Amino acid sequence: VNSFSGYLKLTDNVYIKNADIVEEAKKVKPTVVVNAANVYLKHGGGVAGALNKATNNAMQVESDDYIATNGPLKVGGSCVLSGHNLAKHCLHVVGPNVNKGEDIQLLKSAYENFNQHEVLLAPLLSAGIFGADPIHSLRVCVDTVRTNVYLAVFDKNLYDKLVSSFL
Ligand SMILES: COc1cncc(C(=O)NCCNC(=O)c2ncccc2O)c1
């Protein structure tokens, strides 16, 4: 038993809710919150901008030190940093950005990072400003992630579509 509340169960291990991931993180304090990161960990907008804003820019300060030491992530890759006031840890995962021409097949590799964590609160990778089809992202999630994932979908209209079209 865990503290996540109000989720619709899609599969044995995947759950989904219409929620603001920032508000959900502040209430649950999960072990892991997933950020929709880019390779530079520049948290300017979308999920990343909202998570970073909720940390009062501490996420960005930590991220800049990470990049200065390690260089950029790979598309499809990830790193574990602090969750600040939102979670114990933040798993920064780089899904392919369609608006940059990145290969959508890398979406499966991106979701594989979730398997290193027993339970996660996460957004749909490559959705929103990353330009992928969220229905496709949900399908890849269900077919790739084997650990317990609680998906927060900000847009109510999208949440209902995602639910109604789920196979
Ligand atoms: C590319 O295919 C698509 C099909 N249908 C919908 C989308 C989409 O992402 N729509 C934007 C949904 N809104 C939000 O996520 C949102 N989040 C936070 C605050 C306010 C907000 O409106 C994409």
Chart the SSEs and their pairings.
Blueprint: E1 8-9, E2 14-18, H1 21-28, E3 32-36, H2 46-54, H3 58-70, E4 78-82, E5 89-93, H4 106-112, E6 119-122, H5 134-144, E7 148-153, H6 156-164
Parallel strand pairs: 2-7, 3-5, 6-7
Antiparallel strand pairs: 1-2, 4-5
Helix pairs in contact: 4-5
Subunit structure: May form homohexamers. Interacts with N protein.
Membrane topology: Multi-pass membrane protein
Protein name: Papain-like protease nsp3
Q: Could you explain the architecture of this structure?
A:
The chain is α/β, with parallel strands linked by helices and 167 residues long. The chain has one domain: Leucine Aminopeptidase, subunit E, domain 1 (3-Layer(aba) Sandwich). Helix content is 34%, strand content 19%. The protein contains six helices and seven strands; from the N terminus they run E-E-H-E-H-H-E-E-H-E-H-E-H. A four-stranded mixed β-sheet has the order 1-2-7-6, sandwiched between helices. Strands 3-5-4 form a three-stranded mixed β-sheet, covered by helices on one side.
* CATH C-level category: Alpha Beta
Helix-and-strand structural type: alpha/beta
Q: Rg from C-alpha positions?
A: 14 Å
Q: Roughly what fraction of the amino acids lie in strands?
A: 15-25%
* Total discrete domains: 1
Bound molecules: ligand RJL
* Broad shape: globular
